[PDB]
């Protein structure tokens, strides 16, 4: 009843206050670790026909 209504409080408190609040240098280390896994792998990569069009432009071709 009333005794376990704080058992949900203290157990979830262990994973409450430190969530990149306690470590400073392990957070900036961890921020870029998350930054390189989601925010970096973008899709500018539509160069792949401009390049192979510009490699076959003349001898022996640059692509050949």
């Amino acid at each position: 009843l009333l005794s376990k209504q704080r058992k949900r409080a203290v157990v979830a408190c262990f994973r409450m206050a430190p969530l990149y609040n306690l470590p400073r240098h392990r957070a900036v280390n961890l921020f870029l670790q998350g930054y390189e896994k989601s925010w970096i792998e973008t899709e500018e990569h539509y160069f792949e026909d401009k390049l192979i069009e510009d490699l076959a432009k003349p001898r022996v071709d640059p692509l050949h």
Binding site: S3, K4, R6, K7, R8, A9, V10, V11, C13, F14, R15, M16, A17, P18
Partner: protein, 68 residues
């Protein structure tokens, strides 16, 4: 001051002053969550300071100051 002693005495099962992982597992498996071992080891070692591993009395009180 004393009700957190009562929650500690409910959490303490073997009478040693250091709460191990097993009592947290046996209260968690009746609380309402289904965790992994790494998250449960974190919930004892998220407030870890020196390498004792287990949560003892004074850091449990100063953590109870940091919630209620």
């Amino acid at each position: 001051i004393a009700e957190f002693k009562e929650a500690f005495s409910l959490f303490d099962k073997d009478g040693d002053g250091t709460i191990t992982t097993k009592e947290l597992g046996t209260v968690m498996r009746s609380l309402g969550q289904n965790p992994t071992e790494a998250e449960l080891q974190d919930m004892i070692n998220e407030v870890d300071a020196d390498g004792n591993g287990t949560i003892d009395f004074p850091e449990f009180l100063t953590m109870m100051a940091r919630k209620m």
